[PDB]
Design a binder for this molecule. Structure first.
Ligand SMILES: Cc1cc2nc3c(=O)[nH]c(=O)nc-3n(C[C@H](O)[C@H](O)[C@H](O)COP(=O)(O)OP(=O)(O)OC[C@H]3O[C@@H](n4cnc5c(N)ncnc54)[C@H](O)[C@@H]3O)c2cc1C
Ligand SMILES: Cc1nc2c(=O)[nH]c(=O)nc-2n(C[C@H](O)[C@H](O)[C@H](O)CO)c1C
Ligand code: SF4
Length: 508
């Protein structure tokens, strides 16, 4: 009866974590490690380092107030070995323990390493039931399905969770109210001001430490406004539910120059480390519709992102890894252009996305998908280099969610497991969906020449390069038909242009 050592990782900062259930406060110890292995696995955005480390330090103080004995190993500790496994060994030598208890993490490499660790005591690994769909439940649903479509999974999750269900029927008589013909913001509509969280004393200390010790990481730390504890995260969620949720379904795909937040919730960095709960978030949104404070299409569109896409991408990650991390369906071998890190590009849309990534460690979905993600696909950047960028620059970036959205939906490197079809688009899409192109130095109505918008020739070269494969796909009928009606001289023209753009941008 010596007690159990309970490991808590940087994205596991929840009281209801399975590793903390049924703890014996008089015998057990909680281990939390500020790990430089994890801090340099990718060179995370400086704001992500501030977010995680400030939140772990406050989460540890919260556990101590509840009677937990917490062994907190800071990054200034001269005896910190730097790794989770090394610090688990050091904690087991410090005193007697009967076993180690932990919760399955969200990175396959770390999870595989921990499962293979040879410790002096047994190590029990519990499932992370903070998610709404267990790993086993997704595998059971995916069994026998020749393709995994989010819509059928989303319907199952609506029945399991009972969210937006009247009896056995979905609210409103249909599952999905996704209204097509989405458009850019009207010229007079100014996006509202958003709530930011001024750093608390703990966050200020971590901020100064990150400014001084990790200066060679991407991004600015100044202006850090992310929530770092449940109260600050609830304040962000309260602000979204009351002030932005009613407009969620209107501008979900719009882009406005230097308005990086629009009406999005901005909860992913706090949700992904456990500061908010997925079921509680969705129930609050449903209650807004049930009590007449938000329309159904807005609330359903919001809940679909969380119980649908978020659970879907996690399901595919753990279902297909580790082979998923190595898939390269389009044989993309190019380098990532330097303006992804510096933002020094004449493409206004790309420059604004990198600017938001640098200044706020955030960019909303359609920019990650249709701007920087689409461009990396069209350019043929190696999927390893695209994964590294999305892991580094966004404060919500963890491999279980970053990779299926990046290697899958954004760049089709998984052959269509996640997205079922590549989301390629020319500058015409960005033009219809944003206010970028009129202020851009390029001309979105041109495909050849120095003034031509690079997305235009790169898009048609992409469809031309993968024409035979995309014909078997099926969902690319209209672009292939237009390409087939194009004379040979026009085909060779945008080909030459696309090769030149790949050289100009340092890709290949
Ligand atoms: C290339 C690419 C990379 C991405 N990388 C990440 C990542 O590292 N981490 C991450 O959390 N999300 C990632 N996403 C999903 C999505 O871009 C973000 O969840 C969202 O932009 C975060 O902003 P928000 O909280 O305001 O989202 P909202 O627009 O307010 O959406 C509400 C919530 O829905 C969830 N959600 C929405 N779309 C997705 C999605 N596609 N996958 C999973 N959850 C989703 C998030 O929890 C989000 O907080 C990525 C998407 C793409 C296309
Ligand atoms: C920056 C960072 N730092 C730490 C840390 O110091 N200690 C820790 O235990 N975890 C950290 N993490 C999170 C992990 O690297 C990893 O992404 C998640 O735990 C996956 O579940 C991250 C992302
Ligand atoms: S013209 Fe092309 S590069 Fe410029 S903002 Fe529009 S889509 Fe982006």
């Amino acid at each position: 009866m010596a007690g159990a050592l309970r490991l808590v990782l940087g994205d596991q900062l929840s009281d209801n974590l399975s590793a903390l259930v049924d703890a014996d406060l008089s015998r057990d110890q909680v281990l939390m490690v500020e790990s430089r292995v994890e801090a340099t696995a990718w060179k995370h955005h400086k704001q992500k380092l501030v977010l995680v480390w400030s939140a772990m330090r406050q989460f540890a103080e919260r556990l101590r107030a509840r009677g937990f004995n917490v062994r907190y190993v800071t990054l200034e500790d001269p005896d910190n070995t730097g790794s989770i496994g090394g610090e688990l060994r050091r904690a087991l030598e410090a005193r007697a323990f009967d076993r180690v208890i932990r919760t399955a993490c969200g990175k396959w490499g770390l999870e595989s390493h921990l499962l293979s660790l040879d410790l002096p005591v047994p190590m029990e690994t519990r499932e992370d039931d903070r998610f709404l769909c267990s790993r086993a439940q997704f595998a059971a649903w995916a069994e026998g399905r020749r393709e995994l479509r989010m819509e059928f999974f989303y319907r199952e999750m609506r029945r399991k969770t009972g969210l937006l269900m009247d009896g056995d029927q979905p609210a409103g008589g249909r599952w999905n109210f996704d209204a097509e013909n989405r458009r850019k913001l009207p010229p007079g509509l100014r996006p509202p001001e958003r709530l930011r969280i001024p750093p608390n004393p703990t966050t200020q200390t971590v901020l100064e430490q990150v400014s001084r010790g990790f200066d060679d990481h991407f991004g600015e730390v100044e202006g850090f406004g992310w929530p770092t504890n449940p109260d600050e995260a609830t304040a962000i969620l309260d602000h979204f539910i009351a002030d932005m949720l009613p407009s969620f379904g209107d501008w979900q795909d719009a882009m406005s120059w230097r308005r990086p937040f629009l009406w999005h919730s901005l909860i992913s960095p706090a949700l992904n480390i456990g500061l908010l709960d997925p079921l509680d978030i969705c129930r609050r949104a449903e209650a807004a519709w049930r009590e007449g404070r938000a329309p159904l299409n807005a609330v359903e569109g919001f809940i679909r992102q969380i119980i649908g896409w978020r659970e879907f991408v996690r399901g595919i990650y753990w279902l297909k890894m580790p082979e998923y991390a190595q898939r390269n369906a389009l044989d993309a071998q190019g380098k990532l252009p330097g303006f992804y890190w510096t933002g020094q590009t004449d493409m206004a849309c790309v420059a604004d996305t990198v600017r938001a990534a640098h200044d706020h460690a955030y960019a909303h979905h359609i920019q990650r998908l249709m701007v920087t993600g689409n461009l990396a696909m069209l350019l043929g950047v190696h999927p390893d280099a695209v994964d590294d960028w999305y892991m580094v620059v966004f404060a919500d970036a963890y491999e279980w969610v970053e990779m299926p959205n990046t290697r899958g939906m954004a760049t089709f490197a998984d052959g269509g497991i996640v997205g079922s079809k590549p989301y390629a688009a020319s500058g015409a899409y960005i033009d219809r969906m944003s206010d970028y192109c009129k202020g851009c130095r390029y001309d979105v109505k041109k495909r050849l020449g120095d003034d031509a918008c690079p997305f235009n020739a790169l898009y048609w070269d992409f469809i031309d390069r993968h024409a035979q494969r995309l014909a078997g796909n099926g969902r690319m009928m209209m672009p292939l038909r237009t390409l087939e009606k194009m004379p040979d001289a026009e085909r060779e023209a945008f080909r030459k242009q696309a090769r030149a753009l790949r050289v100009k941008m340092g890709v290949s």
